[PDB]
């Protein structure tokens with residue numbers, strides 16, 4: 065191939081290598097389940113329950 | 125109007141999620157590995173906002189006939205502002221790290237090319253139709269759900 | 275000398291222990307655990323190119339270790355050799371022999 | 377310590393065994409294999425002869441021998457590929473049409 | 477007798493080098509996982525043991541006690557034969573490397589020639605794995621991979637010939653002694669980059685990487701540990717051939733050798749994590765049209781410079 | 788209580804052989820190699836679990852081989868269609884012992900919402916399943932929770948150490964179900980956060 069695009073490609077490979085090397089020093093985005101408890105929003109749709117009224121009986 | 129703006133918000137959020145997954149999977153198909161991890165971190169930010177809004181990640185089932193299921197929770201603007209501050213630097217980083225690599229360009233440029241006639245005669249729409257120069261987006265040609273206001 | 279025979283023994287033990295460890299871990303892998311089209315000529319073309327250019331490479335291997343005592347006349351002979359080799363390589367590239375895609 | 381006669385005996389044995397491999401096999405691949413055995417055995421003979429006298433002439437003729445062996449491998453395998461392409465078999469008495 | 481004592485000490489040093497490099501290859505695979513995690517903003521395996529260091533033992537136990545499966549309609553001898561080739565060829569390629577003054581396995585007068593024999597024998601692992609699997613997909617994949625590694629092996633020795641010419645001998649002790657004033661990376665930089673590309677490609681590393689979809693259990697472990705042994709081998713070779721070997725100003729020489737080798741292994745990790753994969757024909761064009769004339773011109777210029785200084 | 792497949796038996800486990808069995812099960816549970824099998828939505832959540840924001844690699848389960856011979860664990864992450872049911876059966880039959888099955892999603896558990904003509908109602912109709920995960924889709928942390936459940940099941944089983952000496956019989960552990968185990972604390976929940984807040 066043409067030497068110009070070869071040199072540009074080599075420089076771009078060096079740029080990608082350097083960007084991953086800079087990423088090596090960043091902070092981790094890992095949420096450490098199960099040691100870190102997973103935060104869930106209050107209206108998240110998970111395990112289904114049947115609740116009770118403030119008197120104490122079952123609401124259903 | 126508020127229903128239209130809410131549905132536009134969630135549709136655009138899921139569009140960003142789908143586009144992030146698509147770009148990361150294409151980059152992984154070319155051969156680079158890190159952008160799929162980074163784009164899935166961004167997808168987790170999106171999923172945090174969507175979990176706050178609806179209560180689910182992938183299939184919220186939140187739109188209704190005549191509106192949406194619930195109202196917006198007290199404090200969604202903080203999460204949206206955090207996501208909008210988080211995105212563009214990472215998107216530029218993705219472009220610089222993988223989408224400007226000349227090996228990726230050699231793998232992807234000029235591969236499986238077709239003109240506007242092949243896109244029209246096969247019914248291809250979306251980015252495959254707009255890459256032929258045919259400016260046909262449904263959000264601008266046949267507007268819906270308050271997309272004119274944006 | 276003691277040094278050369280000692281290093282010959284060390285190389286022999288190196289080879290023997292490497293082969294023995296590798297086949298031993300094969301034996302350990304086998305021993306444990308309970309039970310339950312037509313190609314194209316381009317492969318031949320590039321392999322035969324590889325063979326011919328490896329023989330050219332062996333000639334340059336013989337040359338490169340003795341450049342100092344061969345003098346400038348050896349440089350001239352190797353220059354003719356390398357120019358013939360590069361002419362052959364340019365010939366293969368230009369006629370589309372080394373181009374994998376048709 | 378190693379006699380020269382032993383080296384030439386070994387080289388001769390490998391050469392004549394390659395001659396059997398060339399003669400008795402109808403498959404052209406095994407014929408080329410036997411040819412390579414014979415030329416490599418004769419190269420071994422040259423190396424033994426050069427190592428007896430203490431000269432590099434045997435190694436130089438060995439280098440020429442392996443160059444010939446490589447190029448002959450290339451030509452013979454190309455011809456074998458052409459024979460398999462145009463006849464769909466490697467029988468050497470199938471290519472026997474010219475006679476008399 | 478002191479002669480037998482010296483013989484036993486040399487044998488002990490050689491076997492120490494052997495177990496050290498095998499353990500270094502296995503822990504280098506563990507460091508592959510950890511450093512890929514570090515480069516990709518995560519942790520990697522860090523739960524099995526203190527810091528994850530016992531993940532390797534659990535993985536090796538799992539591959540040991542996995543049910544071995546030779547295919548029913550395969551060729552048994554060739555199918556099991558490819559992994560010992562892939563392991564032993566690169567191990568004996570490492571066998572010539574002098575890691576320290578006095579800590580050398582064999583001072584062979586051929587040296588880098590012996591590395592060339594082992595690198596030539598290494599292609600039979602891929603070819604035998606492709607044929608013996610009795611799978612046409614694996615056969616096609618191994619044909620492509622073997623053509624790749626042949627097209628990039630064809631200039632490996634020619635890249636090393638600049639260092640051979642500057643040293644004036646094939647022995648590695650002379651090579652690491654000729655780098656006393658200046659390291660060979662400075663005059664042989666084009667030889668350095670061509671040798672690095674060739675060494676990456678003949679190890680079938682990214683971005684030069686199926687013919688392994690039929691191996692399982694300990695055969696896959698053999699293939700992979702042999703590949704990492706080859707990574708360590710190529711790193712130590714380029715340390716000894718271009719970066720002065722064990723020679724260093726302040727630290728003990730083994731520390732310099734280990735630091736340079738670890739730098740080159742982490743460069744392997746970064747090269748895999750960073751660059752994408754080029755297409756097959758583009759790789760062929762780069763290996764034939766560019767690298768081989770570059771090595772030839774580098775050898776010619778090296779010879780001209782060597783004969784120019786010695787008027 | 789233990790289950791035989793070659794029935795309901797007792798724990799058969801000498802103390803040295805038990806120690807080696809413990810190390811074998813430890814090395815098996817600390818290295819699980821899932822099969823890269825992309826069916827449906829739940830596979831996308833699996834590869835969400837594999838990435839950096841979640842890092843299932845910490846458990847030594849980041850291998851994700853493309854060949855059934857190399858992989859150990861089959862995660863049915865999607866719907867079992869009538870056209871892909873023989874494909875799933877062949878991919879399961881092309882695996883090697885030990886083999887574990889995790890069914891992600893209501894599709895793989897029972898067919899889910901798709902009680903339809905072209906859907907097999909659960910992968911347990913024709914392959915055994917080690918661990919089920921409910922959810923449509925299960926979140927990535929639920930996939931990790933099922934991974935630790937599979938690790939706990941592996942650490943208690945007693946597979947044959949060798950094929951030449953020992954009882955060649957699969958000894959799975961009848962674990963206490965998670966519903967009865969967590970009923971002591973799920974019922975005790977009294978007040979949750981109101982959904983109007985974030």
Ligand SMILES: CCCCCCCCCCCCCCCCCC(=O)OC[C@H](COP(=O)(O)OCCN)OC(=O)CCCCCCCCCCCCCCCCC
Pocket residue numbers: 065069070071072073074077078081226227229230231233234672673676683710711714740741743744747754755758759761762
């Ligand atoms: C023990 C230590 C070793 C550790 C590793 C260190 C060395 C790593 C070497 C890796 C080598 C990778 C070689 C890849 C060659 C690819 C050639 C090629 O053809 O690439 C395709 C691409 C486009 O090709 P083209 O034909 O122009 O496309 C037009 C059609 N669309 O063409 C291009 O993009 C052109 C440019 C190709 C690449 C140029 C050379 C790059 C070399 C890699 C970067 C090295 C950075 C420094 C590494 C550390 C050094 C100390």
Ligand SMILES: C/C=C(/C)[C@H](O)[C@H](C)/C=C(C)\C=C/C/C(C)=C\Cc1[nH]c(OC)c(OC)c(=O)c1C
Pocket residue numbers: 152157505506508509512535700834837838849850851
């Ligand atoms: C010691 C011997 C071994 C076999 C080691 O256990 C490890 C497994 C070896 C290595 C080399 C580590 C990592 C490479 C790898 C096997 C997978 C990464 C990966 N991970 C994904 O998800 C997170 C993906 O997305 C779908 C991917 O595409 C890819 C490519």
Ligand code: SF4
Pocket residue numbers: 827828829864865866891892893894895899922923924925
């Ligand atoms: S269970 Fe739900 S999320 Fe999973 S594959 Fe089925 S439809 Fe998709």
